[PDB]
Design a protein around this ligand. Structure first.
Ligand code: GLN
Ligand code: GLN
Ligand code: MG
Ligand code: MG
Ligand code: MG
Ligand code: MG
Lengths: 443, 5, 443, 5
């Protein structure tokens, strides 16, 4: 408990806020919110605000359903770009049924349920550190995004330099001012691609920070006449954007993944987690990569993962074990992209790891022989398997796997499947200019 | 239900 | 009694107002007003101002009739956008005959008469909460509205964001400053469509707040180079604008619609009100949807009601029962649009509910089987009936129903019928560009 | 009477 009701009232009085954005996240990952004046703040703190819960279902909503808006006090953040006519503050809210029960269709509530299951098994917390990457594009005269990148930088290069501009520096400075724990910030391989690293927090706090980071980055980029995009693969032939997740599991003693007497200084819990993560990777690939464009990133030659394998040092492994040990022991999943919903991805990953721990599965031997060297047939003999190549195949794999369904819940699973099938059907029947360029003149 | 299509 | 004459004089002296707009509402719903200097304010408070009452009849006025302008002290509001050369204040006024009798053709007086009948039957107040939705369009170079929306938002989406603009945020702030009880404000399904919710007040106060809200929203949108429209269906293939009414009936004990021992925690009074509302819905559909464009909104597939049925959770029911209970028990009618006259709509709805209570009618069973699934014939076997498909059919239904005529009064009924028949004839004989696009070349 | 028409 970081803040209380009285603290929130005092903050609202002293910082002179007149608007509060009670925000939440739908199934598709879009940040939505209800806006209330400061005069209603007391009612908001009484968990008495009603709204339409069907919006959580996204565009596949059918029937209006009334739901409560239980806010979280610890998520109180005051925005700085609010001029002087009253400031704006936000609090991430939980969704509750009218019968005082958390909504099963809320991704945050689902993540809380999965964390409760993990605590039941014996662990304390699930620390996560994300590595989101984003692209910056120049705006047009009509304030519309173009295809021109802001700079032709390189990997870890000092490309933006000093003397103005350097949108990454301004973004990180305002994030630090807003109260974000930023570890580092650097230029990525692709031109105009930047990465900012976070500190390791709890699962829920990390997901909330991810959403707030996306919002703040987009707003600040728009301030400087730029468009910040988190599309997995905005351009062809260039490196994509990833959101590598470094996860660690903790218990009463300390880090559960660390064991000085184990092989690679890894505990049996870490190996069981690896086995669970690798066994069901084909299952949750759809959740971790929920867009059509996402699977355009999962292609060989751009450091994105393409095969289900783990290693300590390899060219684009699905799961990577960083060399750091002790309390910093962690497992990195590299298949996640910034377009994914953080809550759903964390829920499915935690469910897979928990299932692996419960079943005590033995992970396959790590591969370090450049699996890209052989053909598909030459590596299918071993345990190396391909990730789904399209969103439809990933959806089929979701519909087959049961543990991921249990980790998502029936409501979320059904609505996610419906929306993604609609998306796939919409993309399949479209006629793209590629087809015209390839066949209009030839045929 | 289908405002995208 | 919130204000007295001395209070009004003190306010006029201290805020330095030089103009007072004595305003009222005609049959068609247009806000009209007579403008007087502050020096006449005393006379205005003596109920001695004469004006032409025929303006209440709208364009179908024939003979000039002198009428008094009894103002309401509790409606004193000082506008903020008045510069320094004297401020402007308004008071909603009642219309009285020269023989010191309220005018029967005034919608506000008619609503007061219906409320008197309700109090005679035994109830105390009729609380109403409206949910108006409006569209925002960009203005042209000549300050003329265009067909381009201000933003491509979504349902409950954080589309306008921070960093300037956000007309909705500016509007609700000025409404709060002016002394409005705003519950919440969010983005609607359609792009450029916004919804601001009110607190539940009395019928007359709610209608006055609706009119003032329309005026203030239009003025503020014009301030920021935008056009705010309350047309039920400005664009084809996009969600329309509605003004759902959440009504509750109160008595000496408390909420008359709440009963912990009843089915669905609803009292017999609530069921009688439902039966009355559903029985005469075909009758007052004309009053609740008085424009030609209104029936363009009442089409399937856009969440607008199309069949006479009630449910607690269904895709677009005519009457919806929110899950909230206790003092918040209420019935929601969703067929009302922002173009309707609030006073006439409340009068006819109250008359229908009162008739249902007096006759003790049994409401039909709620439908939850997606009535849209069957055809018209397959659902006409049950109690499900279609709303009128055009304004002419609704006018015929008005001319048939007698209870709605009694609730409207002879003067208002005759003038409304005349104006609406003129409107229907004007629309019927017009030649639209649709017809030319469909037949000019073919035939 | 009929300004609209
Ligand atoms: N240097 C790197 O590891 C970048 C990896 C690549 N940008 C990705 O999204 O996977
Ligand atoms: N989400 C909704 O219920 C909106 C309903 C729709 N805008 C109408 O006018 O009825
Ligand atoms: Mg990186
Ligand atoms: Mg990494
Ligand atoms: Mg609405
Ligand atoms: Mg409603």
């Amino acid at each position: 408990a970081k803040y209380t009701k009285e603290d929130i009232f005092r903050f609202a009085d002293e910082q002179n806020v007149k608007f509060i954005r009670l925000q939440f996240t739908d199934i598709l990952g879009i940040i939505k919110n209800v806006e209330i004046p400061v005069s209603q703040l007391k009612k908001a703190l009484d968990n008495k605000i009603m709204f339409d819960g069907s919006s959580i279902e996204g565009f596949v909503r059918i029937e209006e359903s009334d739901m409560y808006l239980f806010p979280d006090l610890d998520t109180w953040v005051v925005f700085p770009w609010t001029a002087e006519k009253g400031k704006v503050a936000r609090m991430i809210c939980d969704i509750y049924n009218p019968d005082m029960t958390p909504f099963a269709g809320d991704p945050r509530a689902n993540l809380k349920r999965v964390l409760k299951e993990m605590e039941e098994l014996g662990f304390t917390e699930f620390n996560l550190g994300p590595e989101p990457e984003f692209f910056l594009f120049k705006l047009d005269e009509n304030r519309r995004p173009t295809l021109e990148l802001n700079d032709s930088g390189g990997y870890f290069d000092l490309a933006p330099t000093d003397l103005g501009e350097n949108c990454r520096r301004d973004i990180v400075l305002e994030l630090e001012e807003m109260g974000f724990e930023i570890e580092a910030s650097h230029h990525e391989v692709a031109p105009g691609q930047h990465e900012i690293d976070f500190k390791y927090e709890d699962a829920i706090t990390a997901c909330d920070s991810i959403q707030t980071f996306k919002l703040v980055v987009k707003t600040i980029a728009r301030k400087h006449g730029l468009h910040a995009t988190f599309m997995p693969k905005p351009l062809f032939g260039v490196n994509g954007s990833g959101m590598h997740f470094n996860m660690s599991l903790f218990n009463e003693k300390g880090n559960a993944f660390f064991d000085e007497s184990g092989e690679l200084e890894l505990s049996q819990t870490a190996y069981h987690f690896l086995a669970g993560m690798l066994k069901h990777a084909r299952g949750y690939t759809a959740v971790t990569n929920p867009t059509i464009n996402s699977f355009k990133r999962l292609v060989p030659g751009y450091e994105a993962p393409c095969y289900i394998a783990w290693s300590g040092k390899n060219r684009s492994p699905l799961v990577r074990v960083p060399s750091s040990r002790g309390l910093s022991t962690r497992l990195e999943l590299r298949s996640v992209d910034p377009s994914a919903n953080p809550y759903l991805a964390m829920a499915v990953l935690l469910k897979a790891g928990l299932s692996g721990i419960k079943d005590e599965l033995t992970p396959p031997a790590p591969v370090d022989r450049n699996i890209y060297g052989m053909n598909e047939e030459e590596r299918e003999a071993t345990g190396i398997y391909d990730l789904p190549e399209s969103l439809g195949h990933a959806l089929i794999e979701l519909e087959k796997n049961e543990i991921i369904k249990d980790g998502l819940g029936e409501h979320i699973f059904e609505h996610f499947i419906e929306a993604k099938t609609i998306e796939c059907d919409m993309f399949r029947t479209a006629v793209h200019p590629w087809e015209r360029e390839q066949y209009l003149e030839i045929y | 239900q289908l405002p995208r299509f």
